[PDB]
A paper describes a structure:
We focused our attention on human [name], an ATP-dependent recombinase crucial for homologous recombination (HR) and for error-free repair of DNA double-strand breaks. We therefore explored the possibility of using a more stable orthologue as a surrogate and focused our efforts on archeal [name] from [name], a protein that was already structurally characterised and is closely related to human [name].
The structure of HumRadA2 also highlighted the need to introduce further mutations at the back of the Phe pocket (particularly V232Y216) in order to force I169M158 and K221M210 into the same conformation as observed in the HsRAD51:BRC4 complex.
Residue numbers in the entry: 108 to 285, 310 to 349
Amino acid sequence: ATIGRISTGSKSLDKLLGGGIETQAITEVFGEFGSGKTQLAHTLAVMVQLPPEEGGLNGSVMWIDTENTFRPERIREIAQNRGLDPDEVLKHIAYARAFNSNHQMLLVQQASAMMVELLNTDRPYKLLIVDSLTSHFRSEYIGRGALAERQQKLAKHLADLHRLANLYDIAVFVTNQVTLRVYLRKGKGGKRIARLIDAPHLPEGEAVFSITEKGIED
Ligand SMILES: [Ca+2]
């Protein structure tokens, strides 16, 4: 399968990422609360549903939520401001709340069966969001005696996510706090800045973007 790319909505950020977030990859976006990481997840959940000429992959979305960050009204807003049907865009997002780290791991293992079901349809899954990758692991595995089990379980979880990305030709997008690593920070005037770091086949760099009624854009 040739790698597909989903536009972030920001031309500057897309350029930094080599065209958009990639299928067959995990993109891991770091930042503090309000940094833009969750706004970017909501934007991508709309963009991926568009045709390739408009920056999408005609795809369905799966959203695994660990910190109650998914906002259906934000999806509706982004969809409408981009001239799309809000009800239709929302219907193509399969939402699952993860109650703890073990459940989060199970949901990703169970996702394989769901991906197979839409694989040869008009709207195969093309994007899996995990917002956030680590909140449950950090809340549950505190201190020295818990570190080994936490790193082993997180490494297994990441392997399971990579397997989904590669087997079903989807982009996996996950958020984190301090894979293709992007770090977000506050810029000037409410702008946000993304920095791509340690990418094997993309140079490091930065992109400035805005959060608007359309989600993310330059
Ligand atoms: Ca955010």
